Protein backbone atom coordinates (compact mmCIF):
# COMPACT_ATOMS: atom_id res chain seq x y z
CA UNK A 1 0.00 0.00 0.00
CA UNK A 2 1.42 3.35 -1.15
CA UNK A 3 0.55 6.99 -1.82
CA UNK A 4 1.94 9.12 -4.66
CA UNK A 5 2.38 12.88 -4.85
CA UNK A 6 4.80 15.51 -6.12
CA UNK A 7 6.86 12.88 -7.91
CA UNK A 8 7.61 10.79 -4.83
CA UNK A 9 5.87 8.10 -2.81
CA UNK A 10 5.05 7.15 0.74
CA UNK A 11 5.40 3.48 1.59
CA UNK A 12 2.72 2.52 4.12
CA UNK A 13 4.00 -0.96 4.95
CA UNK A 14 4.97 0.31 8.41
CA UNK A 15 3.38 3.03 10.57
CA UNK A 16 4.46 6.59 9.79
CA UNK A 17 4.67 9.41 12.29
CA UNK A 18 3.18 12.75 11.25
CA UNK A 19 4.54 15.69 13.22
CA UNK A 20 2.21 18.61 13.95
CA UNK A 21 3.35 22.07 12.79
CA UNK A 22 0.80 24.54 14.15
CA UNK A 23 1.22 27.98 12.58
CA UNK A 24 -1.71 29.85 14.16
CA UNK A 25 10.31 35.09 13.19
CA UNK A 26 7.26 32.91 12.46
CA UNK A 27 8.63 31.39 9.26
CA UNK A 28 12.06 30.99 10.86
CA UNK A 29 10.73 29.19 13.93
CA UNK A 30 8.38 27.01 11.89
CA UNK A 31 11.24 25.69 9.79
CA UNK A 32 13.35 25.14 12.91
CA UNK A 33 10.57 23.02 14.41
CA UNK A 34 10.08 21.08 11.18
CA UNK A 35 13.79 20.28 11.17
CA UNK A 36 13.69 18.97 14.75
CA UNK A 37 10.65 16.83 13.94
CA UNK A 38 12.29 15.42 10.82
CA UNK A 39 15.45 14.61 12.82
CA UNK A 40 13.26 12.94 15.45
CA UNK A 41 11.95 10.65 12.70
CA UNK A 42 8.75 12.29 11.41
CA UNK A 43 8.16 11.34 7.76
CA UNK A 44 5.21 13.73 7.24
CA UNK A 45 4.87 17.29 8.51
CA UNK A 46 1.33 18.60 9.05
CA UNK A 47 1.03 22.36 8.50
CA UNK A 48 -2.13 24.04 9.73
CA UNK A 49 -2.99 27.73 9.82
CA UNK A 50 -6.60 27.73 11.07
CA UNK A 51 -7.62 26.50 14.50
CA UNK A 52 -9.58 23.24 14.56
CA UNK A 53 -10.36 23.47 18.29
CA UNK A 54 -13.92 23.55 19.71
CA UNK A 55 -15.31 27.08 19.45
CA UNK A 56 -12.49 28.32 17.19
CA UNK A 57 -12.81 31.53 15.19
CA UNK A 58 -12.60 31.28 11.41
CA UNK A 59 -9.54 32.73 9.66
CA UNK A 60 -9.72 34.78 6.43
CA UNK A 61 -8.25 33.17 3.31
CA UNK A 62 -5.60 35.91 2.95
CA UNK A 63 -4.32 35.33 6.52
CA UNK A 64 -4.38 31.55 6.16
CA UNK A 65 -2.40 31.88 2.95
CA UNK A 66 0.16 34.07 4.73
CA UNK A 67 0.53 31.54 7.56
CA UNK A 68 0.67 28.35 5.53
CA UNK A 69 2.08 28.87 2.02
CA UNK A 70 5.58 30.17 2.86
CA UNK A 71 5.98 27.44 5.49
CA UNK A 72 5.05 24.70 3.04
CA UNK A 73 7.30 26.27 0.40
CA UNK A 74 10.33 26.53 2.67
CA UNK A 75 10.02 22.92 3.83
CA UNK A 76 9.48 21.53 0.34
CA UNK A 77 12.63 23.21 -0.94
CA UNK A 78 14.91 22.38 2.00
CA UNK A 79 13.76 18.88 2.98
CA UNK A 80 12.58 15.61 1.40
CA UNK A 81 9.86 14.99 3.97
CA UNK A 82 6.21 14.74 2.88
CA UNK A 83 3.97 17.68 3.71
CA UNK A 84 0.28 17.70 4.59
CA UNK A 85 -1.85 20.82 4.90
CA UNK A 86 -4.83 21.28 7.22
CA UNK A 87 -7.15 23.45 5.21
CA UNK A 88 -10.79 23.64 4.20
CA UNK A 89 -10.29 26.46 1.66
CA UNK A 90 -10.11 25.81 -2.13
CA UNK A 91 -7.53 28.54 -2.61
CA UNK A 92 -5.21 27.24 0.11
CA UNK A 93 -5.50 23.77 -1.42
CA UNK A 94 -4.48 25.07 -4.85
CA UNK A 95 -1.65 27.30 -3.63
CA UNK A 96 -0.33 24.64 -1.25
CA UNK A 97 -0.19 22.09 -4.05
CA UNK A 98 1.61 24.64 -6.24
CA UNK A 99 4.45 24.98 -3.68
CA UNK A 100 4.87 21.26 -3.02
CA UNK A 101 2.36 19.97 -0.44
CA UNK A 102 1.72 16.21 -0.68
CA UNK A 103 -1.48 15.57 1.26
CA UNK A 104 -4.69 17.55 1.64
CA UNK A 105 -5.87 17.06 5.20
CA UNK A 106 -9.26 18.67 5.61
CA UNK A 107 -11.15 18.17 8.87
CA UNK A 108 -14.28 19.21 6.91
CA UNK A 109 -13.63 16.58 4.21
CA UNK A 110 -13.83 19.09 1.33
CA UNK A 111 -17.34 20.19 2.31
CA UNK A 112 -16.68 23.88 1.61
CA UNK A 113 -17.94 25.20 -1.75
CA UNK A 114 -15.31 24.52 -4.40
CA UNK A 115 -13.09 22.48 -2.06
CA UNK A 116 -13.94 19.13 -3.65
CA UNK A 117 -13.14 20.40 -7.12
CA UNK A 118 -9.93 22.16 -6.04
CA UNK A 119 -8.73 18.96 -4.32
CA UNK A 120 -9.40 16.83 -7.39
CA UNK A 121 -7.62 19.36 -9.61
CA UNK A 122 -4.46 18.95 -7.52
CA UNK A 123 -4.28 15.19 -8.07
CA UNK A 124 -3.08 14.86 -4.47
CA UNK A 125 -3.91 12.38 -1.71
CA UNK A 126 -6.91 13.52 0.33
CA UNK A 127 -7.74 12.55 3.93
CA UNK A 128 -11.40 12.08 4.80
CA UNK A 129 -11.93 12.75 8.50
CA UNK A 130 -15.22 12.19 10.29
CA UNK A 131 -16.70 15.10 12.20
CA UNK A 132 -20.19 15.48 13.63
CA UNK A 133 -21.39 19.02 12.85
CA UNK A 134 -18.77 21.74 12.78
CA UNK A 135 -16.02 23.00 15.12
CA UNK A 136 -18.13 25.87 16.45
CA UNK A 137 -20.65 23.57 18.12
CA UNK A 138 -19.52 19.95 17.62
CA UNK A 139 -18.62 19.52 21.30
CA UNK A 140 -21.82 20.98 22.79
CA UNK A 141 -23.70 17.68 22.80
CA UNK A 142 -22.16 14.90 20.70
CA UNK A 143 -24.76 12.18 20.19
CA UNK A 144 -24.80 8.86 18.37
CA UNK A 145 -27.08 5.85 18.33
CA UNK A 146 -24.09 3.83 17.13
CA UNK A 147 -20.89 5.85 16.71
CA UNK A 148 -18.94 3.13 14.87
CA UNK A 149 -21.81 2.50 12.49
CA UNK A 150 -22.37 6.22 11.79
CA UNK A 151 -18.68 6.91 11.21
CA UNK A 152 -18.46 3.88 8.94
CA UNK A 153 -21.53 5.11 7.00
CA UNK A 154 -19.93 8.53 6.65
CA UNK A 155 -16.80 6.99 5.09
CA UNK A 156 -18.92 5.01 2.59
CA UNK A 157 -20.73 8.22 1.57
CA UNK A 158 -17.64 10.45 1.39
CA UNK A 159 -15.66 7.89 -0.62
CA UNK A 160 -18.51 7.88 -3.13
CA UNK A 161 -18.53 11.69 -3.14
CA UNK A 162 -14.79 11.81 -3.91
CA UNK A 163 -14.92 9.08 -6.56
CA UNK A 164 -17.76 10.84 -8.39
CA UNK A 165 -15.69 14.03 -8.40
CA UNK A 166 -12.88 12.06 -10.01
CA UNK A 167 -10.78 11.47 -6.91
CA UNK A 168 -9.96 7.75 -7.06
CA UNK A 169 -9.90 5.45 -4.02
CA UNK A 170 -6.14 5.09 -4.46
CA UNK A 171 -5.74 8.72 -3.32
CA UNK A 172 -7.95 8.54 -0.21
CA UNK A 173 -7.11 8.18 3.50
CA UNK A 174 -9.63 7.66 6.31
CA UNK A 175 -9.56 9.22 9.78
CA UNK A 176 -12.24 8.60 12.41
CA UNK A 177 -11.62 12.14 13.76
CA UNK A 178 -11.03 11.58 17.47
CA UNK A 179 -12.49 14.48 19.43
CA UNK A 180 -14.50 15.92 16.53
CA UNK A 181 -18.08 15.88 17.77
CA UNK A 182 -17.43 12.98 20.15
CA UNK A 183 -17.43 12.49 23.90
CA UNK A 184 -14.98 10.33 25.85
CA UNK A 185 -16.89 7.07 25.41
CA UNK A 186 -17.44 7.75 21.68
CA UNK A 187 -13.70 8.15 21.25
CA UNK A 188 -12.83 4.90 22.98
CA UNK A 189 -15.56 3.00 21.12
CA UNK A 190 -13.90 4.03 17.86
CA UNK A 191 -10.37 3.33 19.05
CA UNK A 192 -11.47 -0.12 20.29
CA UNK A 193 -12.86 -0.99 16.85
CA UNK A 194 -10.36 0.82 14.66
CA UNK A 195 -9.17 -2.36 12.90
CA UNK A 196 -12.67 -2.86 11.47
CA UNK A 197 -12.24 0.21 9.26
CA UNK A 198 -9.66 -1.77 7.26
CA UNK A 199 -12.49 -3.20 5.17
CA UNK A 200 -12.32 -0.09 2.93
CA UNK A 201 -8.80 -1.21 2.08
CA UNK A 202 -7.60 2.36 2.54
CA UNK A 203 -4.84 4.00 4.61
CA UNK A 204 -5.96 4.89 8.15
CA UNK A 205 -4.81 8.11 9.77
CA UNK A 206 -5.45 8.87 13.43
CA UNK A 207 -4.78 11.86 15.64
CA UNK A 208 -5.07 11.44 19.41
CA UNK A 209 -1.93 13.20 20.70
CA UNK A 210 -2.55 15.11 23.97
CA UNK A 211 -6.30 15.20 23.25
CA UNK A 212 -9.18 15.32 25.71
CA UNK A 213 -9.83 11.62 25.37
CA UNK A 214 -6.60 11.30 27.34
CA UNK A 215 -7.07 14.40 29.51
CA UNK A 216 -10.61 13.60 30.62
CA UNK A 217 -9.60 10.01 31.32
CA UNK A 218 -6.57 10.91 33.45
CA UNK A 219 -7.85 14.33 34.63
CA UNK A 220 -4.60 16.07 33.66
CA UNK A 221 -3.69 19.09 31.55
CA UNK A 222 -2.18 19.10 28.04
CA UNK A 223 1.45 18.85 29.20
CA UNK A 224 0.88 15.70 31.28
CA UNK A 225 -0.53 13.55 28.48
CA UNK A 226 2.52 11.99 26.82
CA UNK A 227 2.17 8.49 28.33
CA UNK A 228 -1.54 8.33 27.47
CA UNK A 229 -0.84 9.66 23.96
CA UNK A 230 1.77 6.96 23.39
CA UNK A 231 -0.65 4.32 24.63
CA UNK A 232 -3.25 5.59 22.13
CA UNK A 233 -0.66 5.65 19.33
CA UNK A 234 0.44 2.10 20.12
CA UNK A 235 -3.15 0.85 20.36
CA UNK A 236 -3.90 2.39 16.96
CA UNK A 237 -0.76 1.16 15.25
CA UNK A 238 -1.16 -2.38 16.64
CA UNK A 239 -4.50 -2.40 14.86
CA UNK A 240 -2.77 -1.46 11.63
CA UNK A 241 -3.16 2.34 11.52
CA UNK A 242 -0.83 3.73 8.86
CA UNK A 243 -0.19 7.28 9.99
CA UNK A 244 -0.12 8.67 13.52
CA UNK A 245 -0.47 12.42 13.95
CA UNK A 246 1.38 13.69 17.00
CA UNK A 247 3.11 16.51 18.83
CA UNK A 248 5.80 14.35 20.39
CA UNK A 249 7.63 12.79 17.48
CA UNK A 250 10.76 11.22 19.03
CA UNK A 251 8.87 9.30 21.67
CA UNK A 252 6.20 8.24 19.19
CA UNK A 253 8.74 7.05 16.60
CA UNK A 254 10.39 4.93 19.34
CA UNK A 255 7.03 3.43 20.23
CA UNK A 256 6.29 2.62 16.59
CA UNK A 257 9.60 0.77 16.20
CA UNK A 258 8.47 -1.56 18.98
CA UNK A 259 5.09 -1.94 17.32
CA UNK A 260 6.77 -2.67 13.98
CA UNK A 261 9.06 -5.32 15.52
CA UNK A 262 6.03 -6.99 17.10
CA UNK A 263 4.00 -6.84 13.86
CA UNK A 264 6.89 -8.35 11.85
CA UNK A 265 6.98 -11.35 14.18
CA UNK A 266 3.22 -11.84 13.84
CA UNK A 267 1.36 -13.90 11.23
CA UNK A 268 -2.21 -7.06 12.80
CA UNK A 269 -4.32 -7.13 16.00
CA UNK A 270 -8.12 -7.14 16.17
CA UNK B 1 -13.40 -13.36 36.77
CA UNK B 2 -9.77 -14.20 37.49
CA UNK B 3 -8.58 -13.63 41.05
CA UNK B 4 -5.66 -14.47 43.29
CA UNK B 5 -5.91 -14.97 47.05
CA UNK B 6 -3.19 -14.47 49.66
CA UNK B 7 -2.73 -13.25 53.22
CA UNK B 8 -6.48 -12.75 53.68
CA UNK B 9 -6.96 -10.44 50.70
CA UNK B 10 -7.43 -10.81 46.98
CA UNK B 11 -6.14 -9.41 43.73
CA UNK B 12 -8.84 -8.71 41.12
CA UNK B 13 -7.35 -9.53 37.73
CA UNK B 14 -10.27 -8.19 35.69
CA UNK B 15 -8.02 -5.29 34.69
CA UNK B 16 -4.26 -4.98 34.35
CA UNK B 17 -2.13 -4.28 37.42
CA UNK B 18 1.17 -2.43 37.52
CA UNK B 19 3.88 -4.08 39.63
CA UNK B 20 6.61 -1.68 40.73
CA UNK B 21 10.21 -2.87 41.11
CA UNK B 22 11.81 -2.30 44.51
CA UNK B 23 15.51 -3.14 44.38
CA UNK B 24 17.14 -4.00 47.73
CA UNK B 25 20.07 -6.01 46.32
CA UNK B 26 18.09 1.51 53.83
CA UNK B 27 14.93 0.01 55.29
CA UNK B 28 13.86 3.64 55.52
CA UNK B 29 14.71 4.27 51.88
CA UNK B 30 13.06 1.00 50.79
CA UNK B 31 9.82 2.06 52.48
CA UNK B 32 9.98 5.51 50.98
CA UNK B 33 10.48 4.12 47.49
CA UNK B 34 7.59 1.74 48.05
CA UNK B 35 5.44 4.69 49.15
CA UNK B 36 6.23 6.60 45.95
CA UNK B 37 5.33 3.63 43.75
CA UNK B 38 2.01 3.07 45.56
CA UNK B 39 1.22 6.80 45.26
CA UNK B 40 1.95 6.44 41.56
CA UNK B 41 -0.61 3.64 41.40
CA UNK B 42 1.30 0.37 41.70
CA UNK B 43 -0.89 -2.30 43.25
CA UNK B 44 1.90 -4.85 43.64
CA UNK B 45 5.47 -4.27 44.81
CA UNK B 46 8.17 -6.72 43.67
CA UNK B 47 10.92 -7.08 46.29
CA UNK B 48 14.29 -8.60 45.32
CA UNK B 49 17.17 -9.36 47.71
CA UNK B 50 19.47 -11.35 45.46
CA UNK B 51 19.62 -9.66 42.07
CA UNK B 52 18.25 -11.69 39.19
CA UNK B 53 20.52 -9.94 36.67
CA UNK B 54 23.21 -11.89 34.82
CA UNK B 55 26.23 -12.74 36.97
CA UNK B 56 24.85 -10.90 39.99
CA UNK B 57 26.68 -11.85 43.18
CA UNK B 58 25.20 -14.90 44.88
CA UNK B 59 24.46 -14.45 48.58
CA UNK B 60 24.09 -16.74 51.60
CA UNK B 61 20.73 -17.72 53.05
CA UNK B 62 21.38 -15.52 56.06
CA UNK B 63 22.30 -12.49 53.96
CA UNK B 64 19.26 -12.79 51.69
CA UNK B 65 17.00 -13.17 54.77
CA UNK B 66 18.53 -10.07 56.36
CA UNK B 67 18.01 -8.15 53.13
CA UNK B 68 14.54 -9.32 52.19
CA UNK B 69 12.52 -10.13 55.30
CA UNK B 70 12.63 -6.75 57.04
CA UNK B 71 11.55 -5.05 53.81
CA UNK B 72 8.62 -7.37 53.18
CA UNK B 73 7.63 -7.02 56.82
CA UNK B 74 7.80 -3.22 56.79
CA UNK B 75 5.70 -2.94 53.64
CA UNK B 76 3.12 -5.48 54.79
CA UNK B 77 2.69 -3.56 58.05
CA UNK B 78 2.47 -0.12 56.48
CA UNK B 79 0.58 -0.63 53.22
CA UNK B 80 -2.32 -2.55 51.66
CA UNK B 81 -0.38 -3.23 48.46
CA UNK B 82 0.40 -6.78 47.38
CA UNK B 83 3.99 -7.94 47.76
CA UNK B 84 5.91 -10.09 45.34
CA UNK B 85 9.18 -11.60 46.58
CA UNK B 86 11.99 -12.48 44.14
CA UNK B 87 13.77 -15.50 45.58
CA UNK B 88 14.88 -19.02 44.76
CA UNK B 89 15.66 -20.14 48.34
CA UNK B 90 13.23 -22.37 50.36
CA UNK B 91 14.05 -20.54 53.59
CA UNK B 92 13.37 -17.12 52.11
CA UNK B 93 10.12 -18.40 50.60
CA UNK B 94 9.04 -19.68 54.03
CA UNK B 95 10.03 -16.63 56.03
CA UNK B 96 8.66 -14.16 53.48
CA UNK B 97 5.22 -15.75 53.70
CA UNK B 98 5.42 -15.52 57.47
CA UNK B 99 5.78 -11.79 57.38
CA UNK B 100 3.15 -11.17 54.72
CA UNK B 101 4.34 -11.73 51.14
CA UNK B 102 1.57 -12.41 48.64
CA UNK B 103 3.40 -13.79 45.63
CA UNK B 104 6.46 -16.00 45.24
CA UNK B 105 8.24 -14.76 42.18
CA UNK B 106 10.99 -17.18 41.31
CA UNK B 107 12.85 -16.67 38.09
CA UNK B 108 14.15 -20.22 38.53
CA UNK B 109 10.58 -21.54 38.82
CA UNK B 110 11.20 -23.28 42.18
CA UNK B 111 14.04 -25.37 40.71
CA UNK B 112 16.40 -25.18 43.72
CA UNK B 113 16.28 -28.05 46.25
CA UNK B 114 13.42 -27.52 48.68
CA UNK B 115 11.92 -24.54 46.84
CA UNK B 116 8.96 -26.44 45.35
CA UNK B 117 7.98 -27.92 48.71
CA UNK B 118 8.47 -24.67 50.58
CA UNK B 119 6.30 -22.82 48.06
CA UNK B 120 3.54 -25.42 48.34
CA UNK B 121 3.65 -25.14 52.15
CA UNK B 122 2.99 -21.38 52.10
CA UNK B 123 -0.20 -21.77 50.06
CA UNK B 124 0.75 -18.59 48.19
CA UNK B 125 0.41 -17.78 44.49
CA UNK B 126 3.47 -18.78 42.47
CA UNK B 127 4.80 -17.15 39.30
CA UNK B 128 6.30 -19.62 36.81
CA UNK B 129 8.81 -17.89 34.53
CA UNK B 130 10.53 -19.34 31.47
CA UNK B 131 14.31 -19.14 31.32
CA UNK B 132 16.96 -20.96 29.26
CA UNK B 133 20.41 -18.54 22.77
CA UNK B 134 18.39 -20.54 20.21
CA UNK B 135 14.97 -22.18 19.64
CA UNK B 136 13.28 -24.14 16.85
CA UNK B 137 10.00 -22.44 17.80
CA UNK B 138 10.45 -20.22 20.85
CA UNK B 139 6.70 -20.02 21.50
CA UNK B 140 6.30 -23.79 21.31
CA UNK B 141 9.28 -24.30 23.63
CA UNK B 142 7.96 -21.78 26.13
CA UNK B 143 4.53 -23.38 25.89
CA UNK B 144 6.02 -26.84 26.57
CA UNK B 145 7.84 -25.53 29.63
CA UNK B 146 4.60 -24.14 31.07
CA UNK B 147 2.91 -27.49 30.53
CA UNK B 148 5.81 -29.18 32.28
CA UNK B 149 6.00 -26.74 35.19
CA UNK B 150 2.25 -26.63 35.78
CA UNK B 151 2.26 -30.43 36.15
CA UNK B 152 5.27 -30.41 38.47
CA UNK B 153 3.48 -27.82 40.62
CA UNK B 154 0.14 -29.65 40.66
CA UNK B 155 1.93 -32.85 41.67
CA UNK B 156 3.49 -31.04 44.64
CA UNK B 157 0.06 -29.83 45.71
CA UNK B 158 0.07 -26.34 44.20
CA UNK B 159 -3.32 -26.13 42.49
CA UNK B 160 -3.61 -24.30 39.15
CA UNK B 161 -5.63 -21.57 40.89
CA UNK B 162 -2.36 -20.40 42.49
CA UNK B 163 -0.22 -20.17 39.36
CA UNK B 164 0.83 -17.29 37.11
CA UNK B 165 2.77 -17.70 33.87
CA UNK B 166 5.56 -15.43 32.71
CA UNK B 167 7.33 -15.89 29.35
CA UNK B 168 10.54 -14.41 30.77
CA UNK B 169 11.43 -11.60 28.41
CA UNK B 170 15.18 -11.24 28.06
CA UNK B 171 15.91 -14.57 29.83
CA UNK B 172 17.86 -16.74 27.41
CA UNK B 173 16.31 -14.95 24.44
CA UNK B 174 17.51 -12.71 21.63
CA UNK B 175 15.68 -9.75 20.07
CA UNK B 176 13.82 -11.93 17.58
CA UNK B 177 12.69 -14.42 20.21
CA UNK B 178 11.40 -11.70 22.53
CA UNK B 179 9.28 -10.04 19.85
CA UNK B 180 8.10 -13.45 18.73
CA UNK B 181 6.80 -14.12 22.21
CA UNK B 182 5.31 -10.62 22.57
CA UNK B 183 3.46 -11.00 19.25
CA UNK B 184 1.91 -14.31 20.26
CA UNK B 185 1.39 -13.50 23.95
CA UNK B 186 -2.41 -13.80 23.75
CA UNK B 187 -2.11 -17.46 22.75
CA UNK B 188 -0.91 -18.28 26.30
CA UNK B 189 -4.44 -17.62 27.59
CA UNK B 190 -5.35 -21.20 26.66
CA UNK B 191 -3.94 -22.22 30.08
CA UNK B 192 -6.64 -20.09 31.75
CA UNK B 193 -3.99 -18.69 34.11
CA UNK B 194 -2.82 -15.11 34.86
CA UNK B 195 -0.05 -13.74 32.61
CA UNK B 196 2.74 -11.67 34.13
CA UNK B 197 5.29 -9.91 31.96
CA UNK B 198 8.35 -7.80 32.52
CA UNK B 199 9.85 -5.88 29.63
CA UNK B 200 10.66 -2.62 31.41
CA UNK B 201 13.96 -1.09 30.15
CA UNK B 202 15.20 -4.45 28.83
CA UNK B 203 17.45 -5.36 25.92
CA UNK B 204 14.55 -6.08 23.59
CA UNK B 205 13.90 -2.33 23.72
CA UNK B 206 17.51 -1.15 24.02
CA UNK B 207 18.86 -3.09 21.04
CA UNK B 208 15.89 -2.19 18.85
CA UNK B 209 16.21 1.57 19.50
CA UNK B 210 19.97 1.72 20.23
CA UNK B 211 19.48 3.78 23.41
CA UNK B 212 20.76 3.41 27.00
CA UNK B 213 18.81 2.05 30.01
CA UNK B 214 17.60 5.51 31.08
CA UNK B 215 16.27 6.29 27.58
CA UNK B 216 13.83 3.42 27.13
CA UNK B 217 10.60 4.72 28.69
CA UNK B 218 8.74 5.19 25.41
CA UNK B 219 9.71 1.72 24.25
CA UNK B 220 8.90 0.20 27.65
CA UNK B 221 5.43 1.80 27.57
CA UNK B 222 4.88 0.42 24.06
CA UNK B 223 5.76 -3.11 25.26
CA UNK B 224 3.43 -2.75 28.25
CA UNK B 225 0.51 -1.53 26.18
CA UNK B 226 1.06 -4.27 23.61
CA UNK B 227 1.11 -6.93 26.30
CA UNK B 228 -1.90 -5.47 28.16
CA UNK B 229 -3.95 -5.10 24.95
CA UNK B 230 -3.44 -8.86 24.61
CA UNK B 231 -4.87 -9.42 28.07
CA UNK B 232 -1.71 -9.63 30.20
CA UNK B 233 -2.73 -9.29 33.87
CA UNK B 234 0.34 -7.93 35.61
CA UNK B 235 3.00 -5.61 34.20
CA UNK B 236 6.33 -5.45 36.02
CA UNK B 237 8.02 -2.07 35.53
CA UNK B 238 10.41 0.57 36.83
CA UNK B 239 8.33 3.56 35.77
CA UNK B 240 5.07 3.10 37.62
CA UNK B 241 3.31 6.45 37.10
CA UNK B 242 3.66 6.43 33.33
CA UNK B 243 2.81 2.75 33.03
CA UNK B 244 -0.33 3.20 35.17
CA UNK B 245 -1.50 6.08 32.93
CA UNK B 246 -0.97 3.92 29.82
CA UNK B 247 -2.87 1.05 31.45
CA UNK B 248 -5.79 3.36 32.15
CA UNK B 249 -5.97 4.07 28.40
CA UNK B 250 -5.76 0.30 27.67
CA UNK B 251 -8.60 -0.38 30.14
CA UNK B 252 -10.83 2.31 28.62
CA UNK B 253 -10.18 0.71 25.23
CA UNK B 254 -10.78 -2.89 26.36
CA UNK B 255 -14.00 -1.83 28.14
CA UNK B 256 -15.28 -0.55 24.80
CA UNK B 257 -14.36 -3.80 23.02
CA UNK B 258 -16.60 -6.89 22.71
CA UNK B 259 -13.83 -9.51 22.98
CA UNK B 260 -12.16 -7.53 25.81
CA UNK B 261 -8.85 -8.65 24.26
CA UNK B 262 -6.71 -8.23 21.12
CA UNK B 263 -5.21 -11.24 19.34
C1 LIG C 1 -5.91 19.10 11.89
N1 LIG C 1 -6.28 18.02 12.79
C2 LIG C 1 -6.46 18.13 14.14
N2 LIG C 1 -6.79 16.96 14.67
C3 LIG C 1 -6.81 16.10 13.60
C4 LIG C 1 -7.11 14.71 13.58
O1 LIG C 1 -7.41 14.05 14.57
N3 LIG C 1 -7.01 14.22 12.29
C5 LIG C 1 -6.67 14.96 11.15
N4 LIG C 1 -6.65 14.22 9.99
N5 LIG C 1 -6.41 16.23 11.19
C6 LIG C 1 -6.50 16.73 12.43
C1 LIG D 1 12.75 -10.63 39.02
N1 LIG D 1 12.49 -10.47 37.60
C2 LIG D 1 13.30 -9.81 36.72
N2 LIG D 1 12.80 -9.83 35.50
C3 LIG D 1 11.63 -10.53 35.63
C4 LIG D 1 10.69 -10.85 34.62
O1 LIG D 1 10.82 -10.52 33.45
N3 LIG D 1 9.64 -11.57 35.16
C5 LIG D 1 9.51 -11.94 36.51
N4 LIG D 1 8.37 -12.67 36.80
N5 LIG D 1 10.38 -11.63 37.42
C6 LIG D 1 11.41 -10.94 36.92
Curated annotation (Swiss-Prot), chain B:
- Record EC number: 2.5.1.15
Quote the catalytic activity from the record.
Answer: (7,8-dihydropterin-6-yl)methyl diphosphate + 4-aminobenzoate = 7,8-dihydropteroate + diphosphate
GO terms for biological process, alphabetical: folic acid biosynthetic process; tetrahydrofolate biosynthetic process
Query: What Pfam families does the annotation carry?
Result: Pterin_bind
Q: Which PROSITE patterns match?
A: DHPS_1 (PS00792), DHPS_2 (PS00793), PTERIN_BINDING (PS50972)
Residues annotated as binding (7,8-dihydropterin-6-yl)methyl diphosphate are 52, 86, 105, 166, 202, 236-238
Q: Which cofactor does it need?
A: Mg(2+)
Q: Which InterPro entries match?
A: DHP_synth-like, DHP_synth_dom, Dihydropteroate_synth-like_sf, Pterin-binding_dom
**Which GO molecular function annotations are given, in alphabetical order?**
dihydropteroate synthase activity; metal ion binding
Q: Which residues form a coiled coil?
A: none
Domain called Pterin-binding: residue spans? 16-248
User: Per the record, GO CC terms?
Assistant: cytosol
Write the record's keywords in alphabetical order, separated by commas.
Folate biosynthesis, Magnesium, Metal-binding, Transferase
Family of this protein? Belongs to the DHPS family.
Free-text function comment from the UniProt entry: Catalyzes the condensation of para-aminobenzoate (pABA) with 6-hydroxymethyl-7,8-dihydropterin diphosphate (DHPt-PP) to form 7,8-dihydropteroate (H2Pte), the immediate precursor of folate derivatives.
Descriptive protein name: Dihydropteroate synthase
Q: Which organism is it from?
A: Escherichia coli O6:H1 (strain CFT073 / ATCC 700928 / UPEC)
Q: What is the lineage of its organism?
A: Bacteria, Pseudomonadati, Pseudomonadota, Gammaproteobacteria, Enterobacterales
